[PDB]
Amino acid sequence: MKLEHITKKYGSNVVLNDIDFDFGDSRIVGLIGKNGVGKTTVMKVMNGNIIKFDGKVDIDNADNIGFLIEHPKLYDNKSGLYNLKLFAQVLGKGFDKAYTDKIIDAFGMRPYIKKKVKKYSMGMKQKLAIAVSLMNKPKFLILDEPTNGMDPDGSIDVLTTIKSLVNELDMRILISSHKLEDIELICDRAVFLRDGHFVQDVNMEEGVASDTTIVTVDHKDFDRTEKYLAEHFQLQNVDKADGHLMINAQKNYQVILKALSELDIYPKYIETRKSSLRDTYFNINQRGDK
Amino acid sequence: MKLEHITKKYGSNVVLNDIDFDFGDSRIVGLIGKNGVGKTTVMKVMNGNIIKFDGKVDIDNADNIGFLIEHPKLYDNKSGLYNLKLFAQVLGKGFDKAYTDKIIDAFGMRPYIKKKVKKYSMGMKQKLAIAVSLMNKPKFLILDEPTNGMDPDGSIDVLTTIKSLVNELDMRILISSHKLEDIELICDRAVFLRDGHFVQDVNMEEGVASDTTIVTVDHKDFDRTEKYLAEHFQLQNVDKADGHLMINAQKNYQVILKALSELDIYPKYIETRKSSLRDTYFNINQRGDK
Amino acid sequence: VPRGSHRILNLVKYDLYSIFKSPLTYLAILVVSSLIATQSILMANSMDNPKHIIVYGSVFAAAKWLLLIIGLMFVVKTITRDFSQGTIQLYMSKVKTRVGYIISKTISIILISILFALIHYVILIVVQASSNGKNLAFSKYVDNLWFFLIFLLFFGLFLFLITLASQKTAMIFSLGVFLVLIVPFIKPFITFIPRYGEKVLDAFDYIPFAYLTDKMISSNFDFSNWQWVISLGSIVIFFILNILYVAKKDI
Amino acid sequence: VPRGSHRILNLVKYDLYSIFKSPLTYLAILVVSSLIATQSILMANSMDNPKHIIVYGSVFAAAKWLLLIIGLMFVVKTITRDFSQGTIQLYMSKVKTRVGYIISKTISIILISILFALIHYVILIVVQASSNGKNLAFSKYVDNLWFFLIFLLFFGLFLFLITLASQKTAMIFSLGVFLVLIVPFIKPFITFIPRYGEKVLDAFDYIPFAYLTDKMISSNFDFSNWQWVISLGSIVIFFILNILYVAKKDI
Ligand SMILES: Nc1ncnc2c1ncn2[C@@H]1O[C@H](COP(=O)(O)OP(=O)(O)O)[C@@H](O)[C@H]1O
Ligand SMILES: Nc1ncnc2c1ncn2[C@@H]1O[C@H](COP(=O)(O)OP(=O)(O)O)[C@@H](O)[C@H]1O
């Protein structure tokens, strides 16, 4: 899956200018930009509907591709189960009851799997759209705003279910979406699109050096606590007058506070400061917005 | 705009059951709920699209209603200025050039104000729909999920502009949408909908916000942590699935951690944060959701 | 309330602007005028070698049929525009707006018909001015305008009621084309066969679809008293039914 | 690729399933069958008062006419379903699916035409069994099957090309009805008039639209060699043009 040197013009409006893209050792990627910059256009070009690429796209024929773009596509007069079955037989390899049943109970569409799609709401149609897209058993998933009409609990269960199929079946996901607090729950990296070209690629696992975790302890217990932390993990900044020591961000506090509770140390307070994707977006985009 | 004893049903399913509503000393009111519970049905009942609702809606004839429902409806073939002028003549008292110019300048639509609607994107169409709705100069302005396709800065700008409009002119606003962090920005009162009834009515006016503390621990231990904090201190809300326990604001973590140490259970994440309507929404509706 | 009256007039005015602004109207007018002028010049000036005498019955009938069928298609498109774009739910808020909507649609139908009659007048007048022969009469042109009004009004209200009931556009276009062209086509091939043919032929003088569509080919419009009364009564009945259904339908 | 063959066959099977599972298909069959049976009992069994002899040419032509105009509309609906719901974006992804899509649509056209020919055979055979007269021939029914196939296939590919170029659905339904009913309607009222009428009348035997629509209502049909060459060559050219357009369009 590669894209090489893509330029697309609509009349006098230039959308794409020599873009390269590659899935390198990553499974879920995020696409971020402003409104009308051409993200769905990039998605559409990598998918295949547009034909005048003027460049090179490397796709193996044996790999299947499933997608959801701007709007759900379903048969309105017919039921949902008929739609799932038809697109599994027509686009996918076939239909299997166990696989569709696991999808239906995990997604949560059992009470309404037999109602007519015409009576559904928009969020109901978006969930149906994600399930029909996944029915293809694809090698690449191309989703355009999958969570723009769902309740928060619905967003968490659908993303967790998507991740579960990512590990149980070798899958690569490309997701373009706003609401970065929802994207950050399950994603490995994000790429920022601005003015028609890629500018920044951020890997969230490795982090930035600005993240800190602040632990405050008693004055009498300060020497012993500092000794244990100096032995075990890395120290970036140390200031005794405030009593705060800056170390690298750690996700689990279990082992750390377990060790201090074993050494009779009880911290007064603990918290962490980290930079999110909203912060990265504003820092990159303030050059043209602020 | 008032509703009295509204009960609308579709065949055997009943969606709304004998509700009352009134804008009492509040300018912006938010409607929050799950998917398919009857939110658009409520907006259609207020606006007038449904006649067989078997009740009484108290509205005045001298008062006009400008609205936004499920998706924008616009003339794709024609231009944006043509759409604004046409809906200003047909629905409003007339066309005001200075007022329309102010709306365009505040929203930021000047670069694309002369381009065809069929060439717009989703966020552009949604913004145009927000402007056409405010074009009517309404006394009551009602919105069905106003922020479908806009970036964080754009949503912030639109919310600030709507607040400046509802304060310069006497307007009463109803907004029904998810993404509650955007909702808490502009709202005076929130009503919660489950099974056709208004279960809760949370009112927020000033920014005191009732600061609170979050303790996260796994479910099998979450029972003991909830019982302990209810037996010692006063606890406000709990989320069972995520193991989120929200006690009041505590400056010093020492007594909690010491007790949890003789109890031998420990938290994965503990924090202090501003309370929100997202928290209130999960409190009212996880009984039905999970 | 004159405010409501102006709201009606602004809707008819903007519908007229959209019609006068689209390029398909001037492409249709170019094709019809070019075809009518070409057919009249080739057919009248050479098939019998006279001293350039032209009879105007054939041009009258041909221009009437072409302009009527084009105006009908323009009318069906205007009627089904809002249902096509889905903006109708914005115009269906209160009762007074649903009524002003129907009033504006009827007034728009009347204005489009008057405009098309004026157009028919211009093409036939310039053809007569260019050529030589026996000129037609002004009273005939006025009554031709009236016939345009009744035909377009009747079919537009019928198609408006059906499209309100069904909310489907492809059916309206196909039904209008089918209704216009099936009865003149079917009548010669079927009425002369039965022993019930004389009775059914007599009853075709009272079915509004049949005689209104049939008299289109004819170069003169002649109505009996019963025929005129029944046509006017049918339009009034359609208006009352439309008002009643529009004030009880939920969008 | 046999896998692609299975994809096409699954789509044709499901298209046939959606045709066979609708109430309008049986409403149409019941209406056409009731009309034909009512007409035959009322008029063929009592005019000259014979010993209930019936001549089958009029019933043949009438059944052919109703079934052709209904099968044509079922074909237009079938070919326009995907553009109506907008799900066509999911199928026009890669070139191999876009071509298997066109092959599947053609196979669907072939099976719908065959099914309607079988429907014609069953209805007329039951009517013939009930009544009294001289039976028809199987060679007539097989060549009639070929005529159903060629006509329906031709119009469906033409309308498929136009609907591909335009992406509008109302225009296709109107244009289909228009093309079927305008040529037989215009020819008697205009063709016999000129000093060019004989030339145009002779040229009507070479335009595929013209002679297929003229010969649609006839109770007898034998083709000439030139007609066979033009129709088959035209079918091949439309198929090739459809494939070429499908591989270059972007949504
Ligand atoms: N018919 C069209 N085809 C392709 N692009 C278009 C068309 N009309 C307008 N555009 C341009 O596409 C740009 C936004 O492209 P798109 O990627 O489709 O949406 P977004 O970037 O909001 O996801 C706009 O600047 C608009 O000018
Ligand atoms: N004809 C109908 N149109 C719309 N909704 C319907 C209809 N019949 C039943 N409903 C049900 O009413 C419920 C509420 O729908 P809706 O107002 O669209 O969404 P929400 O309540 O999430 O805003 C839906 O679950 C839907 O199934």
The DSSP annotation for A147-212 comes to TSS--HHHHHHHHHHHHHHHHHTT-EEEEE-S-HHHHTTS-SEEEEEETTEEEEEEETTT--TT-E
Q: Cα–Cα–Cα angle for A142, A145, A151, nearest 5°?
A: 130
**D10 vs A contacts (CB less than 8 Å):** 89-90
Residue numbers of B between 18 and 57 with CB closer than 8 Å to C: 47-52
CA A62 to chain B, closest CA, distance in angstroms equals: 34
**Rounded to an integer, what distance in angstroms lies between the CA atom of residue C142 and that of residue C149?**
11
Instruction: Tell me how the structure was determined.
Output: cryo-EM
Residue type, B185: L
Q: Do the Cβ atoms of A133 and A141 come closer than 8 Å?
A: yes
Dihedral, CA of residue B176, residue B177, residue B178 and residue B182, to nearest 10: -110
For residue B282, the surrounding DSSP H or E stretch is helix B277-289
Cα-to-centroid distance, A119 and ligand 2 (Å): 6
DSSP string, A45-94: HHHTS-----SEEE--TTS-EEEE-SS----SSSBHHHHHHHHHHHTSS-
Number of domains observed in the structure of chain B: 1
Q: What is the 3-state secondary structure (H, E, C) of B107-160?
A: HCCHHHCCCEHHHCCHHHHHHHHHHHHHHCCCCEEEEECCCCCCCHHHHHHHHH
Binary contact (D86, A49; C-beta < 8 A): no
Cα-to-centroid distance, A11 and ligand 1 (Å): 12
If you compute the radius of gyration of chain A from its CA atoms, what whole number of angstroms results? 24
- In terms of residues, how long is chain D? 251
Residue type, A153: D
Give me the phi and psi of A37, to 5 degrees please: -85, -25
Residue type, C47: M
Q: Considering all CA atoms of chain B, what is the largest pairwise distance in Å, rounded to the nearest integer?
A: 73
User: Among residues D148, D171, D147, D160, which one has the least CA distance to residue D238?
Assistant: D160
Q: Is B62 on the interface with C (CB under 8 A)?
A: no
**Rounded to an integer, what distance in angstroms lies between the CA atom of residue D143 and that of residue B230?**
89
Q: Cα–Cα–Cα angle for B147, B153, B154, nearest 5°?
A: 45
Please tell me whether residue D202 adopts helix, strand or coil conformation. Answer: helix
Residue showing tokens 């009544």:
D131
Residue B269's DSSP bridge partners are B216
Q: Is D192 on the interface with C (CB under 8 A)?
A: no
Comparing alpha-carbon positions, the chain A residue that sits nearest to B71 is A122
- How far CA C238 is from CA of A282, C99, C158, C161, in Å, comes to 61, 15, 7, 8
Q: How distant is the alpha carbon of residue A197 from its chain centre?
A: 20
Q: Cα–Cα–Cα angle for C210, C211, C216, nearest 5°?
A: 105
Residue A7's DSSP bridge partners are A17
B and D touch per CB criterion (3+ pairs under 8 A)? no
**Rounded to an integer, what distance in angstroms lies between the CA atom of residue D106 and that of residue A49?**
22
Residue type, D121: Y
Nearest to B90 among C10, C94, C249 (CB): C10
Strand order in the sheet with A56-58: A21-22, A2-4, A56-58
Q: Do the Cβ atoms of A40 and A144 come closer than 8 Å?
A: yes
Q: Is C11 on the interface with B (CB under 8 A)?
A: yes
- A212 annotated as a binding-site residue: no
For residue A271, the surrounding DSSP H or E stretch is strand A269-273
Q: Is the dihedral of CA B180, B183, B185, B190 positive or negative?
A: negative
**Rounded to an integer, what distance in angstroms lies between the CA atom of residue D219 and that of residue D95?**
44
C and B touch per CB criterion (3+ pairs under 8 A)? yes
**Rounded to an integer, what distance in angstroms lies between the CA atom of residue A244 and that of residue A215?**
7
Residue A9's DSSP bridge partners are A14
Comparing alpha-carbon positions, the chain D residue that sits nearest to C84 is D170
Please tell me whether residue B48 adopts helix, strand or coil conformation. Answer: coil
User: Which pairing describes strands A189-194 and A28-32: parallel, antiparallel, or unpaired?
Assistant: parallel
Q: Is the dihedral of CA D104, D106, D110, D115 positive or negative?
A: positive
| Ligand 2 contact via B40 beta carbon (within 6 Å) | yes
- String of b and e for B203-240 (b: at least 16 CB within 10 Å)? ebeeeeeeebbbbbbeeebbeebbebbeeeeebebbbe
Strand order in the sheet with B189-194: B65-68, B140-144, B172-176, B28-32, B189-194, B197-203
User: Among residues A279, A268, A262, which one has the least CA distance to residue A214?
Assistant: A268
Q: Is C134 left (phi over 0), alpha (psi -120 to 50) or beta?
A: beta
Q: What residue spans of C22-56 are helical by DSSP H?
A: 23-44
Q: At what angle do helices B277-289 and A152-168 cross, to 10 degrees?
A: 70
D235 contacts: CB under 8 Å, gap ≥ 6: D150, D153, D154, D157
**Rounded to an integer, what distance in angstroms lies between the CA atom of residue B288 and that of residue D64?**
60
Residue showing tokens 């299997």:
A96
User: Which subunits have 3 or more CB–CB pairs within 8 Å of chain C?
Assistant: B, D
Binary contact (B65, C86; C-beta < 8 A): no
For residue D83, the surrounding DSSP H or E stretch is helix D56-85
Residue A235's DSSP bridge partners are A247
Q: Which of A112, A153, A182, A260 to mutate: most B Cβ within 10 Å?
A: A153
Cβ neighbour number for residue A227 with a 10 Å cutoff: 11
User: Which pairing describes strands B19-22 and B140-144: parallel, antiparallel, or unpaired?
Assistant: unpaired
Closest-lying ligand to the alpha carbon of B148?
A: 1
For residue D25, the surrounding DSSP H or E stretch is helix D23-39
Q: Do the Cβ atoms of A88 and A95 come closer than 8 Å?
A: yes
User: Among residues A123, A109, A59, A102, which one has the least CA distance to residue A80?
Assistant: A109
Cα-to-centroid distance, D163 and ligand 1 (Å): 24
DSSP conformation class of D132: B
Q: Which of C59, C159, C181, C199 to mutate: most D Cβ within 10 Å?
A: C181
CA D67 to chain C, closest CA, distance in angstroms equals: 15
Closest-lying ligand to the alpha carbon of A69?
A: 1
What spatial distance separates the first Cα and last Cα of chain C, rounded to whole Å? 25
Q: Do the Cβ atoms of A7 and A17 come closer than 8 Å?
A: yes
**Rounded to an integer, what distance in angstroms lies between the CA atom of residue A119 and that of residue B13?**
12
Q: Considering all CA atoms of chain D, what is the largest pairwise distance in Å, rounded to the nearest integer?
A: 66
Cα-to-centroid distance, B16 and ligand 2 (Å): 11
Cα-to-centroid distance, A56 and ligand 1 (Å): 22
A49 contacts: CB under 8 Å, gap ≥ 6: D89, D92, D93, D250, D251
DSSP conformation class of C87: G
Full residue range of the structural domain in which residue B189 is found: 1-290
- How far CA C69 is from CA of C5, C131, C222, in Å, comes to 31, 26, 20
- B70 annotated as a binding-site residue: yes
Atom 3 of ligand 2, residue of closest alpha carbon: A119
Exposed / middle / buried, residue A120 (Cβ in 10 Å: 0-12, 13-18, 19+): buried
- In terms of residues, how long is chain A? 290
- How far CA B28 is from CA of B68, B132, B155, B169, B237, in Å, comes to 15, 19, 16, 13, 26
- How far CA C160 is from CA of C75, C168, C219, C242, D30, in Å, comes to 10, 11, 29, 8, 28
- How far CA D2 is from CA of A62, B59, D7, D8, in Å, comes to 14, 66, 9, 10
